[PDB]
Design a protein around this ligand. Structure first.
Ligand SMILES: Nc1ncnc2c1ncn2[C@@H]1O[C@@H]2COP(=O)(O)O[C@H]2[C@H]1O
Ligand SMILES: Nc1ncnc2c1ncn2[C@@H]1O[C@@H]2COP(=O)(O)O[C@H]2[C@H]1O
Lengths: 204, 201
């Protein structure tokens, strides 16, 4: 189901706010004191390497918590930027108020922690993929994963997505021009087709 | 610490010699662990069995937590004792009951999951754009940046073999060997013995 009494009980203690596409909701390095929850829309989580190249860590969607990593220890800073990808409606609540809720009904912490565990798995797998997959394998895996994001439109030949070469590069950790060359190959190999800011993935 | 005591008194604690596999990747997850004493390595590997260490965990760390929140999860990684270990253990089902009495125990587990997410994301962002040379270089450069470093005429000095490097980055032993040799021939490092001087800093 989309939601449930526990989530709605939780949401009743929150203020829900709207953000236009491309808003930065969370800035890296700032003090964390607030927990968020996506009621509609999607965001990208961003970090940088030591040279200041931007990497897209994750997409997060409706039903996902954000800003949860500061909850657990005093005086923590936001680990990453979070930017709207889509017009967003986002519930929000102070860590203070959320800690009470946790005592009232620990399941709400269970819900949150299920997401942190999944994130650690997913993020660990990407790490492994740096070393175990080659760049072509990583782009291809990325196309496969994008293909089952909840925003992926349906098509006679498989899932259609919309993403720039730039964005694919930032997800995988390679340049825009490398993505360019590789997509060209992939479709010349009739595994995908790519006309527009928009790509059809066969199978999925 | 009243809460850890309480939690431990509901576990069974066992001893494992250095080098035991505590957790096997792919196996069905139903049990939670907690390191009472000792250190462990958390590892993944490809179809060739190139290993990559995701992390070390130490005394006071939970392990095998990631299957707790959904039925029928498999273990995401191998976990291997690095020293001799004393490891407490508890069924997920009984850990769920403890969480009902005192959610603070889940606060402590989740705090660690958050620290691990932060560390692992950092490594990903820091390595993703590098090739295997970059990643071996940065690794060396980072040990020059830690406490275990001696000084030198030419720069910082470090101890570590080719296996150990292969693990930080994900690559074979022969590949590390080739790249250390290149780096040496390009006079960025010296391999005097099976230790390494990193020229700079
Ligand atoms: N590896 C990741 N995967 C998914 N989301 C993340 C990841 N790293 C950080 N975030 C999110 O981005 C947020 C940045 O602010 P916090 O660290 O408070 O909480 C963080 C998480 O909600
Ligand atoms: N990136 C990581 N950092 C630290 N520990 C991890 C990481 N990935 C997996 N683990 C630990 O390794 C365990 C393997 O079994 P589980 O997936 O049950 O729980 C996992 C975590 O306890």
């Amino acid at each position: 189901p989309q939601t449930d009494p526990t989530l709605e009980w939780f949401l009743s203690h929150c203020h829900i706010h709207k953000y236009p596409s491309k808003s930065t909701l969370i800035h890296q390095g700032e003090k964390a004191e607030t927990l968020y929850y996506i009621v509609k829309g999607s965001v990208a989580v961003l970090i940088k390497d030591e040279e200041g190249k931007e990497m897209i860590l994750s997409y997060l969607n409706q039903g996902d918590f954000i800003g949860e990593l500061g909850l657990f220890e005093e005086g923590q800073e936001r680990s990453a930027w979070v930017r709207a990808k889509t017009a967003c409606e986002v519930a929000e609540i102070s860590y203070k108020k959320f800690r009470q809720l946790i005592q009232v009904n620990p399941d709400i912490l269970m819900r949150l922690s299920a997401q942190m565990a999944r994130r650690l798995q997913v993020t660990s797998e990407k790490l492994g993929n740096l070393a175990f997959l080659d760049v072509t394998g990583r782009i291809a895996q990325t196309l496969l994963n994008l293909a089952k994001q909840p925003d992926a439109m349906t098509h006679p030949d498989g899932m259609q997505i919309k993403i720039t070469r730039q964005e694919i590069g930032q997800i995988v950790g390679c340049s825009r021009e490398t993505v360019g060359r590789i997509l060209k190959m992939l479709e010349d190999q009739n595994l995908i087709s790519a006309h527009g800011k928009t790509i059809v993935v066969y199978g999925t």
